[PDB]
Amino acid sequence: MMFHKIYIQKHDNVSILFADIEGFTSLASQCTAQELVMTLNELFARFDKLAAENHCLRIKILGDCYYCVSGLPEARADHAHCCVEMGMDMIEAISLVREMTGVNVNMRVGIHSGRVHCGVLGLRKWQFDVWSNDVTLANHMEAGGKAGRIHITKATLSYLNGDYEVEPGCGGERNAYLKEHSIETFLIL
Amino acid sequence: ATHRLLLLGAGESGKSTIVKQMRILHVGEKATKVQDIKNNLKEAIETIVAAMSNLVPPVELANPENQFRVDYILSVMNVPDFDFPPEFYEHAKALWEDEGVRACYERSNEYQLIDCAQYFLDKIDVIKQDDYVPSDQDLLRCRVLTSGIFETKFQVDKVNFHMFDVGGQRDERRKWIQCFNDVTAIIFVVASSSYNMVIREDNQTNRLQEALNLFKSIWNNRWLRTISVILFLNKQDLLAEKVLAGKSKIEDYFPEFARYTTPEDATPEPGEDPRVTRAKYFIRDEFLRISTASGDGRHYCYPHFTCAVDTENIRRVFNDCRDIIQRMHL
Amino acid sequence: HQSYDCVCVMFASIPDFKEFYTESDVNKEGLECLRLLNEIIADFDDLLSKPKFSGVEKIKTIGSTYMAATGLSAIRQYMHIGTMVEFAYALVGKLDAINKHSFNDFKLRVGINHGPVIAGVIGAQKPQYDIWGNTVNVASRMDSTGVLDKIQVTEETSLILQTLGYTCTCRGIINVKGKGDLKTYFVNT
Ligand SMILES: CNc1ccccc1C(=O)O[C@H]1[C@@H](O)[C@H](n2cnc3c(=O)[nH]cnc32)O[C@@H]1COP(=O)(O)OP(=O)(O)OP(=O)(O)O
Ligand SMILES: Nc1nc2c(ncn2[C@@H]2O[C@H](COP(=O)(O)OP(=O)(O)OP(O)(O)=S)[C@@H](O)[C@H]2O)c(=O)[nH]1
Ligand SMILES: C=C[C@@]1(C)CC(=O)[C@]2(O)[C@@]3(C)[C@@H](O)CCC(C)(C)[C@@H]3[C@H](O)[C@H](OC(C)=O)[C@@]2(C)O1
Numbered sequence A: 001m002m003f004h005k006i007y008i009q010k011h012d013n014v015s016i017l018f019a020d021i022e023g024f025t026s027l028a029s030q031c032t033a034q035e036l037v038m039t040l041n042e043l044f045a046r047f048d049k050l051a052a053e054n055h056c057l058r059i060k061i062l063g064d065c066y067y068c069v070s071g072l073p074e075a076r077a078d079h080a081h082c083c084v085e086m087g088m089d090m091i092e093a094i095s096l097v098r099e100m101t102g103v104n105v106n107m108r109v110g111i112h113s114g115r116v117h118c119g120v121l122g123l124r125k126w127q128f129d130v131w132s133n134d135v136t137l138a139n140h141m142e143a144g145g146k147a148g149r150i151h152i153t154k155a156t157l158s159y160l161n162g163d164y165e166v167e168p169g170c171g172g173e174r175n176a177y178l179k180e181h182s183i184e185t186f187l188i189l
Numbered sequence B: 001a002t003h004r005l006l007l008l009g010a011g012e013s014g015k016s017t018i019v020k021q022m023r024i025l026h027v028g029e030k031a032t033k034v035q036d037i038k039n040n041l042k043e044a045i046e047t048i049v050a051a052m053s054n055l056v057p058p059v060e061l062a063n064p065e066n067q068f069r070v071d072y073i074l075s076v077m078n079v080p081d082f083d084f085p086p087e088f089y090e091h092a093k094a095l096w097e098d099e100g101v102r103a104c105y106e107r108s109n110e111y112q113l114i115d116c117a118q119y120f121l122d123k124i125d126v127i128k129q130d131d132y133v134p135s136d137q138d139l140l141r142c143r144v145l146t147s148g149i150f151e152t153k154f155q156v157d158k159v160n161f162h163m164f165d166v167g168g169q170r171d172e173r174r175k176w177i178q179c180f181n182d183v184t185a186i187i188f189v190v191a192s193s194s195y196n197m198v199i200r201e202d203n204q205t206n207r208l209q210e211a212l213n214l215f216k217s218i219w220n221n222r223w224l225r226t227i228s229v230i231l232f233l234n235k236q237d238l239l240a241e242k243v244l245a246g247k248s249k250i251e252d253y254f255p256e257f258a259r260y261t262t263p264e265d266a267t268p269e270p271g272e273d274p275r276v277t278r279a280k281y282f283i284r285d286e287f288l289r290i291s292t293a294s295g296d297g298r299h300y301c302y303p304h305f306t307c308a309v310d311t312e313n314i315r316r317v318f319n320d321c322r323d324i325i326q327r328m329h330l
Numbered sequence C: 001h002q003s004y005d006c007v008c009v010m011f012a013s014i015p016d017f018k019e020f021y022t023e024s025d026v027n028k029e030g031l032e033c034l035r036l037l038n039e040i041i042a043d044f045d046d047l048l049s050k051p052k053f054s055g056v057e058k059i060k061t062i063g064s065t066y067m068a069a070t071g072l073s074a075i076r077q078y079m080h081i082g083t084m085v086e087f088a089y090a091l092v093g094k095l096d097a098i099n100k101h102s103f104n105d106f107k108l109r110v111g112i113n114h115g116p117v118i119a120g121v122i123g124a125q126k127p128q129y130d131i132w133g134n135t136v137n138v139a140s141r142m143d144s145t146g147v148l149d150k151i152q153v154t155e156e157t158s159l160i161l162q163t164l165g166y167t168c169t170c171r172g173i174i175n176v177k178g179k180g181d182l183k184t185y186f187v188n189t
C-alpha cells in the first residue's frame, strides 16, 4: 500500500558477467549505421544462443555492451564455471563474427562472483536487471579488462575450484575502481 | 511477536539517550566511555570561555586572576590526543567556580552548548580520579554524535523489539528512508526545552520550530500514512526549570503562547506549578495541531511528557508504549 | 526494424544515487535503496500516461538513468523536440517531490539530442525495443558530461529550441570521443 510492490529479491552465491566491444567507436567510423545494427544483432543473437547452453541468463544489452548472469532463476553450485565457459564461447564467437565485419572487432570480458538483488523497476516497459556493489564491480572488471581475454576476481576464482589456469591480471593498474578497492584480479589462459 | 521501532527527531533531541535506557532496562565495557566523558567536560568549559568575548555584551570574569586559566583553556582547545593532566581539572574547575563563567552559562542559549555541561562540571572532582568509574547517570548524560543507523535488539515479557537509532541532523536524514518499509511505529523525539535556542546545522533556525516542521514532514509523509507516531516531548526537567526561572520567556520566541490557556483534559503531575503545566501542554498541542489536521484515523499520535535521562520516567512511559503497540494490533 | 529521419533522445541520470546506494545488515543489503529508486522510476513513469506527454516513448532505464524519446509516431514539426524538454522539466518536478519526503537533495542531469536513428529489436532470448544511431550516443554524452538541474543540448538542438521560445547559453567545447570536439549548450529557465 505505502510503497509500490518491489519485484526484487536477494540472491547469494551468483556470478555476474560483463563484456564490451573493444574499439566500437573506431569501427563506427567505417560502416553505415544499419550495418552495425546488423553485426550487433548477428553477434548477440549468437550470444543469446550460447547463454542457454552454458546455463546462463542474459540480462540486458546496452548497445555494444552485453551482460548476462549465472545462477538464476534457481541457484547452482556450479555457477562460476558457467560464466567462464560462457566467456570462452563468447570469445571465439566474436572471432567468427569478425569474418562478417572484416574489421578488427574484439570483446573484453569481466566476471565477478558475489551477491545480487534482481528483478524490475518502475511501472512501464519492464526490463530484467541486476544490482549490487558486486554487480557494480563486475562492470569495472570488464572495463579494466584485457582484449579478447577473460578478467576474473579473487572471489570468482574461489568458486572456480582451480580448474582453469590463470595469471596476474593487475586490474589495479587498468581501472581506478579496482585499485581503490585493493581487488586482486586474474586472467584465464 | 516482533515490533520494529524507529526513533525520529531533530539534533540532540535525546534519541540515543532512549536507546541506552533500553540496555539499562531490558538487557566491564564502561571503561571505554570514561574517555568520552572527559571530552564532554573539555568541550563544555572551553565552549563557555570561548563564548564570553563573542557576546553582546561580552561577559567579563568575576576574578581577574582566572584570566590565565582562560588563556590555558583556550591554548589547549584544539590539542588532538589530550591527556587531561590534573592541572586541566584544576583550572577547569576554578573556571567553572568563577561567577562570570556561570553568568556566561546562564546565556548558553545564544551560543551552542551540549546539555550535560552543568552535570559534568559539577563533578570535575569525581571525574578527575584515575580509579574513577562512571555511574549509570553519567553514562546517560554522556554525549556522542550518531552518524548512520544502529540496531540493538531487546525483549520485554518474551516480546521482541528491534530499535533503530539514526542521525538526527539534516545531512543524516537521507538514511532514514531505509527504515520506512515494515516499521511498527515511529518514536518522534523533541527537545521541549530548546524553545529559546537554534540548531547547530546553520546557527539561525529555531530548534523547536525545526522539530515542528520535521514532525510535520513525518506526519504527512507518503510512506507513513498509516504508520503511527509516539511523540516523546523530551527534556521536561530542562523545560520546567527554564520556565520557572523566568529569564527567556516562551512568548518571546513562540508568540502564539500569549493567547493559549491550560486545557481541561490536562492531568498535571502531583504538585506541579501551573506555569509548567501551561507550557508543556502548549508544546504538546503545538505538535497535535500539526497532527489533528491530516491522517483521518489512518494513523495516530501519542503525546508523552518525558525526561530521557531519568530511568524512572522512561520505564513508566515505554510500557505506556508497549501497551499501545499490542492494543492497536500493529 | 526501420530508421527514422528526426527523433528526439533524452538521457537523464541522477549521479547522487550511486554514492547514496549502500549494502548493509540495516538496509537489507541495498534493498531499501532500490526501493526508493523503485518509487522514483515509478514516479517518472507516471508521466508517460499524461495527456501533454502521450507522444513520448519510454525506452529503457540504465542503472538510475531515464532514457526516453520523441517522434517515433510519424511516417510545429519539431513540436516533439520541445515536448521532450517539457518532459525533462516534469521529471525534475517529480524528483523535487521525492526529495521532500525522502530527505535528500537529488539532482537530475539531462542531455537531449535529436536526429536520425535506427529503431527496432535485438536479442534472441527476449527481444526488447531499442534505438541506435549517432544521435543516441551523442545524447548519452550530453548527459555523462552534463550539469545537474540543467539540460545540455547540441547546437542543432539549441537552434530549434530558440525558434520554439527557449533561450540558451553555450557551455563551450565538449570532446565526443570518436566524433571529436563539439560545441554544446545549456537551456535557460
Ligand atoms: C556512430 N555511432 C553509432 C551508429 C549506429 C549505432 C550506434 C552507434 C553508437 O555510437 O552507439 C553507442 C551507444 O549509443 C550504444 N549504446 C549504449 N547503450 C545503449 C542503449 O541502451 N541503447 C542503444 N544504444 C546504446 O553503444 C555505442 C558506444 O558504446 P559506449 O559505451 O558509449 O563506448 P565504448 O567505450 O563502450 O566503446 P569504444 O570507445 O570502446 O569503441
Ligand atoms: N536534563 C536532560 N537532559 C536530557 C534529557 N534527554 C536527553 N538529555 C541530554 O541531551 C543530550 C542529547 O541527547 P542525545 O540522545 O545525544 O540526542 P540525540 O537525539 O540522540 O542526538 P543525535 O544523535 O540525533 S545528534 C545528552 O547529553 C542527553 O543526556 C532530559 O530529559 N533531560
Ligand atoms: C543503481 C544503483 C547502482 C549503484 C547499482 C549498480 O550496480 C548499477 O545499476 C549497474 C553497475 C549494474 O546494475 C549493472 C548494469 C549497469 C547499467 C552497468 C549499472 C549502472 O552502471 C549503474 O550506474 C548508474 C547509471 O547509476 C549502477 C552502478 O548503479
Ligand SMILES: [Cl-]
Pocket: B009, B010, B011, B012, B013, B189, B190, B191, B192, B194, B207, B208, B211
Ligand atoms: Cl528538538
Ligand SMILES: [Mg+2]
Pocket: B015, B016, B017, B144, B145, B146, B166, B167, B168
Ligand atoms: Mg544520537
Ligand SMILES: [Mn+2]
Pocket: A020, A021, A022, A023, A024, A025, A064
Ligand atoms: Mn565498446
Ligand SMILES: [Mn+2]
Pocket: A020, A062, A063, A064, A065
Ligand atoms: Mn558500452
